[PDB]
Scaffold this active site. Structure first.
Site, PDB file in Angstrom:
ATOM      1  N   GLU A 124       0.853  -1.227   0.000  1.00 18.49           N
ATOM      2  CA  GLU A 124       0.000   0.000   0.000  1.00 18.49           C
ATOM      3  C   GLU A 124       0.885   1.273   0.000  1.00 18.49           C
ATOM      4  OE1 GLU A 124      -2.827   0.352   3.216  1.00 18.49           O
ATOM      5  OE2 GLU A 124      -3.848   1.976   2.189  1.00 18.49           O
ATOM      6  N   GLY A 265       3.315   2.358  11.036  1.00 19.88           N
ATOM      7  CA  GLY A 265       3.065   1.539  12.223  1.00 19.88           C
ATOM      8  C   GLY A 265       2.753   0.091  11.920  1.00 19.88           C
ATOM      9  N   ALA A 266       1.842  -0.124  10.946  1.00 18.08           N
ATOM     10  CA  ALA A 266       1.496  -1.474  10.523  1.00 18.08           C
ATOM     11  C   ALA A 266       0.679  -1.465   9.232  1.00 18.08           C
ATOM     12  CB  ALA A 266       0.725  -2.187  11.664  1.00 18.08           C
ATOM     13  N   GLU A 268      -2.376  -3.967   7.040  1.00 15.09           N
ATOM     14  CA  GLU A 268      -3.448  -4.996   7.148  1.00 15.09           C
ATOM     15  C   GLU A 268      -3.502  -6.063   6.042  1.00 15.09           C
ATOM     16  OE1 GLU A 268      -3.873  -1.733   6.337  1.00 15.09           O
ATOM     17  OE2 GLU A 268      -5.589  -1.426   4.909  1.00 15.09           O
ATOM     18  N   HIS A 301      -6.619  -2.113  15.232  1.00 18.04           N
ATOM     19  CA  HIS A 301      -6.809  -1.418  13.993  1.00 18.04           C
ATOM     20  C   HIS A 301      -6.595  -2.273  12.778  1.00 18.04           C
ATOM     21  CE1 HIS A 301      -6.458   2.377  11.477  1.00 18.04           C
ATOM     22  NE2 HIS A 301      -5.828   1.502  10.728  1.00 18.04           N
ATOM     23  N   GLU A 302      -5.406  -2.898  12.630  1.00 18.70           N
ATOM     24  CA  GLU A 302      -5.186  -3.758  11.438  1.00 18.70           C
ATOM     25  C   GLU A 302      -6.176  -4.940  11.378  1.00 18.70           C
ATOM     26  OE1 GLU A 302      -3.633  -1.795   9.571  1.00 18.70           O
ATOM     27  OE2 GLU A 302      -2.306  -0.838  11.074  1.00 18.70           O
TER      28      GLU A 302
END
Ligand SMILES: CC(C)C[C@H](NC(=O)[C@@H](O)[C@H](N)Cc1ccccc1)C(=O)NO
Ligand SMILES: [Mg+2]
Ligand SMILES: [Mg+2]
Ligand SMILES: [Zn+2]
Length: 890
Positions: A124, A265-266, A268, A301-302
């Site tokens: 992404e 941060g991360a 998904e 969140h993810e």
């Protein structure tokens, strides 16, 4: 520059149905062979077939086994591969390419790259095109079959999205693994990992269908002991989505993977969520308290993206807030539920009102659904995430729980397995709204302006009470300042959660209610109101607006003391501080400008200070809430209220206000600092990475806030307390001992001591770097040089670079030195960094966002540096777009 416009969205003339990859990793090259099973869409007009493909070395290109040749059937310019329409089939076809890429030299950390000894992807937004050719946009959904091969000793764990279907040996000490991801997805959700990883695992049984899901969390061997809390947070996340939203996980396995070098941060990726190690790994002896909330938020969140982003994805990148705003909102519901502390909501409001409001009044201002972009990576913004989340939250406020859940269900059910737009979400909420109003002519057309209109609304109030009629009115006005996105602003649908406090007894006078403001102004009248109230406005921070309460400080103190709503109490306090800060700021500014030999300052309200003391001593006020009341508003909040802000006058103002309050309250502060010790530093759960006491952590926060106030004050014998604090087994405490020691000679001994405690854990060393960077030291520039030379050195790890420089940029007195030396330092780092990692270089530009709010000498200095960066040869498109927008050029 090359600009994408929202209005120009059109479906592709092509379809990609299946993607079959072989990724063959070697030491000095990775070979990617890819077959795309493609077709012609109903939108096809016989156009050329154009793929995205950035930095790829072509070995071969074919369609249906026909080799294509450069200059004859295709062209490739390092960005786009064009297949001439004559060689494009008119029905279903197979496109084959083989390319070579080099993760080992990929320091931009987009596409396929090496992080320490782990090979990992980040796709992404536009990173899949750096791995192989694709029509790299989120409406091109496909099913993926992925094989990865590598040396077995170096890369024993091989992962991609979905079910593992085969594992095999290969001659020469290699091996392979094959994956099948049965869920249709856009290419931004592809991921692969290869490394020498260790794991923890557990089995989770789903609540409704009782499906067995295997949960794996992974890291490098050195840090496997730091994985448990993430796993527990994954379990909590799954449970929450099942319990609140009825949503179950949809694969047999979910992997979470930590890597050391990560831009954000991360991420998904379906069934293979990849994290910055700083947002997955913690241990109580080797992490500060804030890691636990961070991991809880990032894992959640993810996870929540599995539906809001994955199972229902984006039609195009302009819809980004549909996944990010909505998932931030889901995570905020989750975290509030898990932590059960009001500080969770307050921290989110504090962030929005400082960072997001500054962005919304800057030249970068954009609506939560942007109208245009050059690099989509520049629009992963606080506006899109945090204002987006508040816009997603307002639906819940407007509908209530029952109807909100119904509208969310409509949305998720209708658009499952497909792309969606912000309009589809608003349509689903509108269905619930019609049900809730019992009226099929009710609509949320107006609500769409929260998606399209930039800028923060201003909501102001006037009150009237008629004691004979027992009748009270609240007159409300809204205004949004015109800007470069809209010369004419429209009224929004603004829900105003309200209560009414009897000033005489401090009690609630009405059932909580939500005023629905839809016009530029409106008057809301309440009957059977027994005495004149103090209104409690925007309870819970019920819309993302500047609130002008038109309350006296005496009214604000009464709310701070007696209101039930944490946000309104905090806001009341904030407003008292802002009134004082503006007044003293103006006083100091006039003295500086007029060169006065003497002048007066307005003292801090003594009734306010008494109210602070009363809250501090109340044993049933939240310790977290208390730490917000003894701290002044953030500098980035304050700046939204001052034009041509002289940062040194502001620093002097803050120092005055703090000294005024400390002169009255320092003994209370000290007494609380000692009385909180036993509960704050109790070792219950110190060996348990599955349970966190968030209340206890807020107690530590408050102690550490108090200790900072007492240290700056040079309270008698506080150095003994700081030395004792440096012996605590909690990193939050011993690193606070380093920051607070800044005011004493012992700073450098604490610097060495804490360095030694931090240096063997990569993540703890980064926390130590931050602590040094944000130290209140007159010699900070020399300290930054020391960190550059002794610790940072040539690191390209975004965490190291961010740790050394960003906290320092929040040093109001030093970063804004009138010489401009702070602006020159950060500009050099930005330009340095932009030659290998454009996304990180743009992150580093953050402090320049406020340039046009500063006094005119500082505006000139910042501008000079921004224009110098803009002149750098080979500046990335990311950095160039950011800077041209920020400087009113684009
Ligand atoms: C809001 C947060 C809990 C975490 C946030 N991550 C995300 O939102 C991911 O879900 C987000 N999809 C990752 C991403 C991708 C490209 C550009 C920017 C960011 C993040 O990485 N922050 O640093
Ligand atoms: Mg290349
Ligand atoms: Mg390192
Ligand atoms: Zn996200």
């Amino acid at each position: 520059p090359k600009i994408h416009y929202r209005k120009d969205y059109k479906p592709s003339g092509f379809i990609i149905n299946n993607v079959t990859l072989n990724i063959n990793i070697h030491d000095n090259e990775t070979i990617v062979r890819s077959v795309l099973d493609m077709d012609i869409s109903k939108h096809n007009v016989g156009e050329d077939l154009v793929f995205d493909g950035v930095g790829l070395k072509i070995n071969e290109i074919s369609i249906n086994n026909k080799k294509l040749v450069e200059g004859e059937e295709y062209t490739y310019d390092n960005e786009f591969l064009t297949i001439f329409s004559k060689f494009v089939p008119k029905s279903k076809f197979a496109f084959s390419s083989e390319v070579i890429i080099h993760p080992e030299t990929n320091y931009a950390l987009t596409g396929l790259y090496k992080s320490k000894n782990i090979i990992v992807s980040q796709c992404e937004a536009t990173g899949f095109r750096r791995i192989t050719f694709f029509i790299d946009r989120p409406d091109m959904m496909a099913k993926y079959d992925v094989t990865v091969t590598a040396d077995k000793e170096k890369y024993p764990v091989l992962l991609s999205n979905g079910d593992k279907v085969n594992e095999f040996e290969i001659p020469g000490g290699r091996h392979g693994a094959r994956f099948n991801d049965p869920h249709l997805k856009p290419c931004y959700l592809f991921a692969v990992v290869a490394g020498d990883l260790k794991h923890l695992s557990a089995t989770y049984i789903t609540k409704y269908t009782k499906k067995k899901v295997e949960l794996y969390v992974f890291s490098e061997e050195k840090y496997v002991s730091k994985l448990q809390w993430a796993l527990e947070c994954l379990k909590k996340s799954m449970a929450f989505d099942e319990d609140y939203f009825g949503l179950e996980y949809d694969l047999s396995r979910l992997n979470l993977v930590a890597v050391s070098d990560f831009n954000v941060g991360a991420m998904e990726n379906k069934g293979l969520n990849i994290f910055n190690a700083n947002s997955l790994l913690a241990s109580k002896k080797n992490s500060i308290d804030f890691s636990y909330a961070r991991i809880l938020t990032v894992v959640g969140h993810e996870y929540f993206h599995n539906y809001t982003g994955n199972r229902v994805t984006l039609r195009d990148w302009f819809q980004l807030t549909l996944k990010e705003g909505l998932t931030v909102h889901r995570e905020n519901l989750f975290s509030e539920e898990m932590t059960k502390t009001v500080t969770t909501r307050l921290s989110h409001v504090d962030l929005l009102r400082s960072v997001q409001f500054l962005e919304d009044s800057s030249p970068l201002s954009h609506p939560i659904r942007p109208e245009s972009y050059v690099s989509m990576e520049n629009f992963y913004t606080t506006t899109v995430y945090d204002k987006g989340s508040e816009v997603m939250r307002m639906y819940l406020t407007i509908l209530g729980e029952e109807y909100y859940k119904k509208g969310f269900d409509i949305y998720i059910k209708k658009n499952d397995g497909n792309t969606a737009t912000c309009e589809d979400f608003n349509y689903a909420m509108e269905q619930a709204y019609k049900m809730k109003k019992a009226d099929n002519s009710a609509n949320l057309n107006q609500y769409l302006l929260w998606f399209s209109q930039s800028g923060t609304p201003h909501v102001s109030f006037k009150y009237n009470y008629d004691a004979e009629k027992k009748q009270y009115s609240i007159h409300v006005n809204q205004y949004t300042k015109p800007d470069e996105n809209q010369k004419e602003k429209k009224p929004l649908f603004i829900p105003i959660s309200v209560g009414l406090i009897n000033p005489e007894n401090g009690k609630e006078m009405i059932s909580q209610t939500t005023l629905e403001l839809t016009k530029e102004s409106d008057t809301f009248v309440f009957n059977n109101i027994a005495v004149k109230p103090i209104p409690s406005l925007f309870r819970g921070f019920s819309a993302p607006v500047y609130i002008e309460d038109n309350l006296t400080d005496e009214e604000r103190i009464l709310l701070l003391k007696y209101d039930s709503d944490a946000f309104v109490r905090y806001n009341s306090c904030t407003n008292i501080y802002m009134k004082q800060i503006l007044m003293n700021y103006n006083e100091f500014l006039k003295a500086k400008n007029e060169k006065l030999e003497s002048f007066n300052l307005t003292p801090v309200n003594a009734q306010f200070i008494d109210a602070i003391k009363y809250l501090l001593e109340d044993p049933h006020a939240d310790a977290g809430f208390k730490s917000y009341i003894v701290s002044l508003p953030q500098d980035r909040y304050i700046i939204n209220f001052v034009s041509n802000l002289d940062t040194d006058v502001l620093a002097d103002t803050k120092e005055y206000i703090y000294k005024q309050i400390g002169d009255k309250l320092n003994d209370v502060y000290y007494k609380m600092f000692k009385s909180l010790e036993a509960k704050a530093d109790d070792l219950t759960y110190f060996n348990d990475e599955s349970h966190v006491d968030f209340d206890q952590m807020n107690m530590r926060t408050l102690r550490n806030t108090l200790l900072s106030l007492l240290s700056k004050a040079q309270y008698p014998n506080i150095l003994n307390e700081i030395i004792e604090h440096s012996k605590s087994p909690y990193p939050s405490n011993w690193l606070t001992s380093l920051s607070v020691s800044a005011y004493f000679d012992k700073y450098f001994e604490l610097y060495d001591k804490t360095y030694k405690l931090s240096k063997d854990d990569e993540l703890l060393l980064q926390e130590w770097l931050k602590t040094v960077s944000r130290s209140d030291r007159k010699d900070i520039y020399e300290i930054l040089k020391k960190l550059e030379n002794e610790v940072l050195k040539d690191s390209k790890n975004p965490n190291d670079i961010r740790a050394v420089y960003l906290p320092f940029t929040n040093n109001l007195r030093r970063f804004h030195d009138i010489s401009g030396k702070g602006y020159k330092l950060i500009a050099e780092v930005i330009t340095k960094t932009d030659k290998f990692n454009p996304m990180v270089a743009t992150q580093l530009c953050e402090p320049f966002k406020l340039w046009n709010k500063l006094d005119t000498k500082r505006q000139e200095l910042m501008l000079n540096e921004m224009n110098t960066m803009l002149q750098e040869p080979n500046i990335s498109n990311n950095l160039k777009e950011y800077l041209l927008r920020l400087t009113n050029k684009l």
